[PDB]
Amino acid sequence: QEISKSIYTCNDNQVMEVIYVNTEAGNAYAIISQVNEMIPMRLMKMGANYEAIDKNYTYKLYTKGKTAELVEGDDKPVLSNCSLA
Amino acid sequence: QEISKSIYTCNDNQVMEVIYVNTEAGNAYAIISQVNEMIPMRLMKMASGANYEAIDKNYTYKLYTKGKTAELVEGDDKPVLSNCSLAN
Ligand code: NA
Ligand code: NA
Ligand code: NA
């Protein structure tokens, strides 16, 4: 059972879903959906921060317990002050 | 090595993205997006090729795939996306 779904409420009246994958061998991933595309991300720092696997994307997901923030480019905010719902 | 994205061309000028998760130890999952939600799915250990069902029992999406082809249905095999093939 290596896959799970989280839903967050974020600033400016928005919702962010994240699918988390945690393999039995210890590899962690996250998938978000932005602009009608699903973007797979890999764990890069450990709260827990994930970065897009496809280098053509610059999305980064920073999580800390039940909170999160999604940025792009030079840590420019996309979704801020996210909290687990 | 474990996560990949497939894009399918389907009937009626529709496109379907699927994220496939295939772990090193051989476990298989899929993720699709419908009605603006991501739906995680698990492989059904059944007749080839690779058929998936939503992990959340509130959803009735099933994804049936065979080689390069796929079909997405819901409920009693009600078509959602039909005659899908890997884009080429
Ligand atoms: Na981007
Ligand atoms: Na047709
Ligand atoms: Na693999």
CATH class held by domain B1-88:
mainly beta
Candidates B33, B34, B41, partner chain A, best to mutate (most A CBs within 10 A): B33
Ligand nearest to the CA of B22: 3
Cα A31 from Cα A78, distance rounded (Å): 15
Q: Do A29 and B38 touch (CB under 8 A)?
A: no
| Nearest residue, CB atoms, A3 vs list B25, B29, B37 | B29
Does A48 reach chain B within 8 Å, measured CB to CB? no
Residue B44 CB contacts under 8 Å (≥ 6 apart), including other chains = B51, B52, B53
Cα diameter, chain B = 38
Cα B29 from Cα A1, distance rounded (Å): 10
Preceding omega of A26 cis (within 30 degrees of 0): no
Contact A14, A33 (CB under 8 A): no
3-state DSSP helix/strand/coil % of chain B, to nearest 5: 5, 65, 35
Q: Experimental method for this entry?
A: X-ray
Fold of A1-85: Lipocalin (2.40.128)
Quote the minimal CA–CA distance from B22 to chain A in Å. 10
In angstroms, what is the resolution? 1.5
Q: What is the CA radius of gyration of chain B?
A: 12
Burial class (CB in 10 A: 0-12, 13-18, 19+), A16: buried
Count of CA atoms in the C-beta half-sphere (13 A) of A41: 29
Please name the residue that has the structure tokens 């993205």: B17
